Amino acid sequence: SENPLLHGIPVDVEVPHISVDEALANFKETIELLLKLSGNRKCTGFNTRVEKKEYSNFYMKSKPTLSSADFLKRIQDKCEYQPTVYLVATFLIDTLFLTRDGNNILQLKLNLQEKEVHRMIIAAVRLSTKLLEDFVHSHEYFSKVCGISKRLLTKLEVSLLICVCNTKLMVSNRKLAASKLLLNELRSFC
């Protein structure tokens, strides 16, 4: 069976004709809504301690030099990715934080905090490029763009990977579509 987040999405849906700027905006707005949802709920959290330990890698003690929006601008200015990269990035955060219950109702799986956002963006973008492109930026280049050490970058890739690999992750047109459709659904409740 499909990723429950796809329930209702036509199997023959077409790749969204979405622009880099819109892709980037949907990514940011998904994060903002997850943050909103996380303040209401006390979540059931992870199935294992393993996942909890990986997830703690996202917590950043200090306030980032750049806001989420500006950080995303810096990444795109330096990397020049296709919109597909951010759509997949958005779906990765979608599948980490959201599921649907027995009645196809969207549910928050985990609490997102603001101190987790900066490192989450780094991981989701990096993992996304590796799922999508035959050639990606060097580990050195990407690290410098994100202003972190190569060691941290590796740690973040693996943390997100461990955290989502229990869900259905296969890149497909319906997952590309879902990134925008889930944002619309969340948008409608907030």
């Binding site: 590796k130 492109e133 590796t154 690999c165």
Partner: protein, 294 residues
């Protein structure tokens, strides 16, 4: 999913971005294959591991190896796969051309697995005998999806350097960055030939020698049968033409087994130079050579 859940046994095989060990689930006592991927803090997570893992929950099929779990330890991800006794390359080395009833049965299963991938819009891109796993019961399953890639998706980059050279399609060798399912079908043709004779059909040592060997047997690209060939960067209209060779006369010397018209037809369906003319995996499954299985 704890590290201590699996006992590590003997090494099975080695690749660039992974070493495979035999393993044992300590609770069930059931064998597994432990694919250990080195994690270098300064180099990042290999793309091959990430892609393979991304398929683990979705590409479930009788002819695709199952990936059960992913375990992170210091400098290492272990991918826990179902255990398979052998791979085609070793099963053959273990003998070299296979009897035709086995050849057909292995080809059937390879194409069943592949049809399921293509139905999911996933290209394997490294089909070769080593990546075809076999067990005692004669089950064959596609393995090693490290190079696999979704098609129909807006990409910025392309590697015409995919697929092990011997199994790489001529349109790809000629610089095509727009192949889809046809890339795997070419490989399937080369595998079929290799099962029949026991020898790689086109054992190139480099890109140029690979095409030379392909054209020697299949003939040079004919622009009338393949107009789009002019769009490939490394296509050369000024090479001397060569007609195709008789495929049977090429193969027959290497096996005591009679190669019939149904089998040779099938093979010609997989090994067309023009990628557009290759059989789809679904078409191939319903070719007359597979008649008996219905």
């Amino acid at each position: 999913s704890s590290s201590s859940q699996f006992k590590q046994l003997e090494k099975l095989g080695n690749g660039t971005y992974a070493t495979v060990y035999k393993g044992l689930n300590k609770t069930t006592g059931v064998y597994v294959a432990l694919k250990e991927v080195k994690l270098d803090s300064e180099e990042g997570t290999p793309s091959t591991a990430i892609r393979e893992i991304s398929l683990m929950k979705e590409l479930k099929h009788e002819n695709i190896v199952r990936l059960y779990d992913v375990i992170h330890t210091e400098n290492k991800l272990t991918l826990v796969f179902e255990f398979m006794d052998n791979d085609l390359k070793k099963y053959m080395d273990s003998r070299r051309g296979l009897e035709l009833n086995l050849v057909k049965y292995f080809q059937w299963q390879l194409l069943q697995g592949l049809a399921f991938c293509h139905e999911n819009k996933i290209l394997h891109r490294d089909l070769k005998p080593q990546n075809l796993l076999i067990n005692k019961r004669g089950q064959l399953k596609l393995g090693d999806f490290g190079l696999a890639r979704a098609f129909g998706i807006p990409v910025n980059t392309f590697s015409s350097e995919v697929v092990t050279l011997w199994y790489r399609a001529p349109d790809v060798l000629m610089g095509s960055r727009t192949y889809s399912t046809s890339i795997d079908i070419w490989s399937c043709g080369c595998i079929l030939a290799e099962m029949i004779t026991g020898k790689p059909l086109f054992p190139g040592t480099n890109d140029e020698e690979q095409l030379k060997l392909i054209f020697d047997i299949m003939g040079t690209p004919n622009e009338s049968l393949w107009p789009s060939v002019t769009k490939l960067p490394k296509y050369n209209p000024n090479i001397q033409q060569r007609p195709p060779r008789d495929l049977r006369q090429v193969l027959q010397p290497h096996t005591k087994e009679p190669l019939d018209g149904n089998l040779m037809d099938f093979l010609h369906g997989l090994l067309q130079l023009n990628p557009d003319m290759r059989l789809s995996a679904k078409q191939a499954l319903h070719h007359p050579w597979f008649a008996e299985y219905y």
